[PDB]
């Protein structure tokens, strides 16, 4: 067929010139049907035409074309994991990018491909959908919607193990496990399998992206033959034999060897050699089926600088003491280890390490550099109890506050009764012994009424410095000086209280509530303590005794001494320490010196959860003996104590406690395991059967003058209460249920059968 | 010292056991319960057990201690 004209239809983004030649036929050529399915397959093989039809007109040869749609943009939706550029990156490589003309036959293949990439992270299956939105002229927007779901695991199996059962190995989120493989490799090396090898690790999978199986294949036997030391030993050959000691029947272990390699290296380090080298080569004997260890030792002064780095909170002066050797002096590798812990013990940092660097232009000098890595600590509590009621307490701590080494604690407390606020500066390791400086500045607002006592108010302030120097690790002694100022006010007149006021030389009205007393006291405080408790929390054996002794130093308005002693003793009954016998005792006795009396705010009191359970807080001891008085806010059909306005003409016996100068309490508990709680968590729970005994009295009481009144000087009146106690470390915080029955109770003693207290931090 | 278990996710550690540290307050008119002294007394326990940092479980202030009034006790795990 003679072609005298050729024309192309549907050409847009592809010019004539292109087509004209990139087809075998041309104007003036003779054409057959062979040249048809060559021309077509050739123009199709241009990869630029959506579709092609090349056929003959009478004289003309006409090309009917549809050009491929040119990509204008590639948009992605649903791809939370894979970055949009990353996803574009994969596509650009495949052949699909903006400007390229898309092959509407490969979308499926593009889908398979992106789906294929999606194994990169956890999604081993998902669905990618092609939106191929048309645009102007013959352009297209290929949008991609990703249905990506996110890895699963339940079976971890070992094949080729004859030395151990799979379960026996299982004795010790899974997305990537590398260190864990090394840990289970060490399982075999620890049992003597030096010729143990992991041949392969397969990750099998079920149809969905959520179902993984881990198969670890193994090749597992050997033991120790002996240790042979050889090198420039530096004459310490006598010592090294002790380090390389071996027990007969020792199964080989590469870490224990390294421990010895480091121990030799440490010894030679202690002897002044900076870089001692210890190498070990194992002589493999498959014949004996035992390795013979060949150890090559190669032993290789002064300190210009002792550097401090990482101290971005603690200034570069406080840390200058925590070690066992000075700068501009000889190096002692052991002295570096002795003082190594000294930085950790402070709890001022987090991580601490050493580095020994050679001094620039020196053949013997080395700079020892210690790298130290938060100091602000915030502690907040809120509780509820029988004593304290709703109790608020908070403390702010800064251990390296503005680089002083001293720790500053600002703590505030508010119970139902007293409100306490203190500012503290502490140094737990001020000197060689481990002596502290218990600096304290404070404020205490005391409300006697809320403390279940006879009414009075004490607002007090002052300071204390207490230096505690340890003696025995079991015995610790503390001693210090304290100044206090107490402004007593609003005291409801009673014999007992007034008695003391008369001792001081102060004489107020016994019919008026209007009164105020101000004292300034200086005191010398001492406190001995012994502790041989096996555990600070829930002890099961040992004993703790505490002694407290206050004494007024001349110049103070008051003149008294106070002495208390706390005893706690635990005695275990079973070999597992689950059944214990407890013995608590508290003694207390203070008194006036200058013919005076000890202040009533410094009295001892018994009762509550604290002491003698079963009784209301502080209810034990002497009771008030009120004087007839006129109440300020007097209202009838309201109860008052010995109010003249209620018809009071003489002294009144009462129920309100006042406490006293002498007191003693004791308890004999019997700890047992909690009844139904499992051993798995039965370490947080303490049941207890206690027998409590207690008394408070007043040695300054006048039995003779007040005949119509009980003898508040008689100590013979012992109260006793027996019960059950339960302590838990519930999530809420610490707690106790102390249900007691006070069988032995005396006059007006108020009962409180169910007691308890809770915390939080 | 470590607070949570997430901080050590994927690390080779040796758990020496359990260590405790506490501060005691005998009466109302005495020094307050010192939680930072209880965190340190737990670390010296872990350093007699010989460890770098301790895994702190829960610092709580006890109400019922048979020797005091309030005692702040910090429970932890000694790690190498």
From Swiss-Prot, chain A:
Changing residue 613 to A: Slow growth on solid and liquid media, less protein accumulates which is more proteinase sensitive. It comes from Escherichia coli (strain K12). Keywords: Cell adhesion, Cell outer membrane, Membrane, Repeat, Signal, Transmembrane, Transmembrane beta strand. The lineage of its organism: Bacteria, Pseudomonadati, Pseudomonadota, Gammaproteobacteria, Enterobacterales. Part of the outer membrane protein assembly complex (Bam), which is involved in assembly and insertion of beta-barrel proteins into the outer membrane. Constitutes, with BamD, the core component of the assembly machinery. Efficient substrate folding and insertion into the outer membrane requires all 5 subunits. A lateral gate may open between the first and last strands of the BamA beta-barrel that allows substrate to insert into the outer membrane; comparison of the structures of complete and nearly complete Bam complexes show there is considerable movement of all 5 proteins. It is found in: Cell outer membrane. Changing residue 347 to C: No effect. Lethal. InterPro entries: Bac_surfAg_D15, BamA/TamA_POTRA, D15-like, OM_assembly_BamA, POTRA. Residues 1-68, 69-149, 151-220, 222-300, 301-373 form the POTRA domain. One of its GO terms (cellular component) is membrane. Residues 386-387, 415-417, 448-456, 488-515, 553-560, 592-660, 698-719, 742-755 are extracellular. Changing residue 536 to C: No effect. Lethal. Disruption phenotype: Deletion is lethal. Depletion results in the accumulation of incorrectly assembled outer membrane proteins, including TolC, OmpF, OmpC and OmpA. Decreased expression leads to decreased susceptibility to contact-dependent growth inhibition (CDI), and decreased expression of outer membrane proteins (including in this study LamB) as well as up-regulation of periplasmic protease DegP. Belongs to the BamA family. Changing residue 752 to L: Very minor growth defect. Lethal. Contains 5 N-terminal periplasmic polypeptide transport-associated (POTRA) domains which interact with other subunits of the complex, may recruit substrates from the periplasm into the outer membrane and also act as a chaperone. The C-terminal region forms a discontinuous 16-stranded beta-barrel transmembrane region. The central pore is ellipsoid, and probably closed by extracellular loop 6, perhaps with the aid of other loops. Part of the Bam complex, which is composed of the outer membrane protein BamA, and four lipoproteins BamB, BamC, BamD and BamE. BamA interacts directly with BamB and the BamCDE subcomplex. The Bam complex has the shape of a hat, with the BamA beta-barrel crown in the outer membrane and the periplasmic brim formed by the BamA POTRA domains and the 4 lipoproteins. The keyword Transport does not apply. Changing residue 327 to K: Lethal, wild-type protein levels. The chain crosses the membrane at residues 377-385, 388-398, 407-414, 418-427, 436-447, 457-458, 475-487, 516-529, 543-552, 561-571, 581-591, 661-670, 685-697, 720-729, 731-741, 756-760. This is Outer membrane protein assembly factor BamA. Residues 1-376, 399-406, 428-435, 459-474, 530-542, 572-580, 671-684, 730 are periplasmic. One of its GO terms (biological process) is protein insertion into membrane.
